[PDB]
Tab-separated table of C-alpha atoms in Angstrom:
chain	number	residue	atom	x	y	z
A	1	UNK	CA	82.426	181.658	100.934
A	2	UNK	CA	82.271	185.492	100.639
A	3	UNK	CA	81.866	186.420	96.906
A	4	UNK	CA	82.393	182.667	95.963
A	5	UNK	CA	79.237	180.811	94.957
A	6	UNK	CA	78.309	177.481	93.358
A	7	UNK	CA	76.166	177.930	90.218
A	8	UNK	CA	72.449	178.917	91.010
A	9	UNK	CA	70.053	175.821	91.007
A	10	UNK	CA	66.653	176.944	89.650
A	11	UNK	CA	64.290	176.671	92.630
A	12	UNK	CA	61.423	178.759	91.157
A	13	UNK	CA	59.193	175.683	90.476
A	14	UNK	CA	59.831	174.018	93.855
A	15	UNK	CA	56.606	175.381	95.493
A	16	UNK	CA	54.420	174.080	92.709
A	17	UNK	CA	56.174	170.767	92.492
A	18	UNK	CA	55.967	170.125	96.355
A	19	UNK	CA	52.162	171.010	96.031
A	20	UNK	CA	51.773	168.345	93.307
A	21	UNK	CA	53.585	165.729	95.333
A	22	UNK	CA	51.444	166.603	98.389
A	23	UNK	CA	48.269	166.266	96.174
A	24	UNK	CA	49.350	162.796	95.123
A	25	UNK	CA	49.971	161.855	98.800
A	26	UNK	CA	46.516	163.288	99.802
A	27	UNK	CA	44.742	161.167	97.154
A	28	UNK	CA	46.548	157.818	97.790
A	29	UNK	CA	44.120	155.225	99.153
A	30	UNK	CA	46.381	154.576	102.159
A	31	UNK	CA	46.552	158.300	103.154
A	32	UNK	CA	43.613	158.006	105.618
A	33	UNK	CA	45.680	157.726	108.854
A	34	UNK	CA	47.591	160.910	107.879
A	35	UNK	CA	44.990	163.328	106.462
A	36	UNK	CA	44.207	165.091	109.751
A	37	UNK	CA	45.873	165.707	113.095
A	38	UNK	CA	45.679	162.805	115.563
A	39	UNK	CA	42.985	163.729	118.127
A	40	UNK	CA	45.050	164.308	121.300
A	41	UNK	CA	41.950	164.197	123.534
A	42	UNK	CA	40.852	160.811	122.165
A	43	UNK	CA	44.113	158.843	121.645
A	44	UNK	CA	45.725	157.937	124.914
A	45	UNK	CA	49.480	158.220	124.976
A	46	UNK	CA	49.812	160.363	121.804
A	47	UNK	CA	50.276	163.717	123.377
A	48	UNK	CA	53.089	162.590	125.719
A	49	UNK	CA	54.895	160.254	123.425
A	50	UNK	CA	54.896	162.144	120.055
A	51	UNK	CA	56.804	165.340	120.682
A	52	UNK	CA	56.042	166.878	117.254
A	53	UNK	CA	52.721	165.759	115.697
A	54	UNK	CA	52.464	166.267	111.922
A	55	UNK	CA	49.869	165.397	109.276
A	56	UNK	CA	49.071	166.200	105.597
A	57	UNK	CA	46.507	168.931	106.335
A	58	UNK	CA	49.024	170.757	108.557
A	59	UNK	CA	51.719	170.433	105.856
A	60	UNK	CA	49.219	171.725	103.266
A	61	UNK	CA	48.428	174.835	105.401
A	62	UNK	CA	52.174	175.489	106.100
A	63	UNK	CA	52.850	175.170	102.321
A	64	UNK	CA	50.045	177.460	101.266
A	65	UNK	CA	51.093	180.187	103.766
A	66	UNK	CA	54.867	180.355	103.040
A	67	UNK	CA	55.950	178.617	106.169
A	68	UNK	CA	58.508	176.355	104.307
A	69	UNK	CA	61.738	178.254	103.631
A	70	UNK	CA	62.928	175.623	101.184
A	71	UNK	CA	62.124	172.151	99.713
A	72	UNK	CA	64.213	170.351	102.440
A	73	UNK	CA	62.098	171.732	105.278
A	74	UNK	CA	59.043	170.401	103.375
A	75	UNK	CA	60.597	166.868	103.076
A	76	UNK	CA	61.453	166.937	106.816
A	77	UNK	CA	57.743	167.421	107.784
A	78	UNK	CA	56.581	164.723	105.351
A	79	UNK	CA	59.194	162.280	106.850
A	80	UNK	CA	58.104	163.343	110.392
A	81	UNK	CA	54.553	162.087	109.544
A	82	UNK	CA	56.032	158.600	108.867
A	83	UNK	CA	58.506	158.597	111.746
A	84	UNK	CA	55.695	159.432	114.123
A	85	UNK	CA	53.602	156.611	112.646
A	86	UNK	CA	56.430	154.079	113.165
A	87	UNK	CA	56.936	155.324	116.742
A	88	UNK	CA	53.294	154.694	117.720
A	89	UNK	CA	52.021	151.790	115.511
A	90	UNK	CA	53.139	148.191	115.199
A	91	UNK	CA	54.569	147.270	111.699
A	92	UNK	CA	51.895	144.532	111.497
A	93	UNK	CA	48.802	146.793	111.752
A	94	UNK	CA	46.810	148.511	109.062
A	95	UNK	CA	48.182	151.932	110.095
A	96	UNK	CA	51.795	150.593	110.452
A	97	UNK	CA	51.582	149.163	106.897
A	98	UNK	CA	49.948	152.358	105.548
A	99	UNK	CA	52.920	154.350	106.861
A	100	UNK	CA	55.520	152.172	105.226
A	101	UNK	CA	53.601	152.240	101.914
A	102	UNK	CA	53.257	156.057	101.979
A	103	UNK	CA	56.933	156.662	102.855
A	104	UNK	CA	57.979	154.500	99.868
A	105	UNK	CA	55.572	156.310	97.591
A	106	UNK	CA	56.850	159.716	98.792
A	107	UNK	CA	60.593	158.896	98.490
A	108	UNK	CA	60.162	157.776	94.871
A	109	UNK	CA	58.269	160.905	93.838
A	110	UNK	CA	60.903	162.982	95.646
A	111	UNK	CA	63.859	161.334	93.821
A	112	UNK	CA	62.149	161.429	90.444
A	113	UNK	CA	61.121	165.092	90.758
A	114	UNK	CA	64.282	166.577	92.315
A	115	UNK	CA	67.378	164.155	92.033
């Protein structure tokens, strides 16, 4: 509350560490469905169904331009990429499987770097 603060967590490395995680996501062999925005002219249904499209390149630009106020807003966009994928793709599809694999990979790196 006013003039009453928990001890200050060092957040000065968070930008660099989110960039490293994002690099590791970008270079995973199963990243290919997620590297670029889904083409809303060429993929019927996507525009109407997925209210908030997200992809790695869009996260990378937001990161590089100071559009994430903190590390939690960064994790929310990464998770949004996988939530969108599960909304639109069957579990038993190459893209459906890619999304589950990448979410697992991300959540481990996140825990090991920050928890």
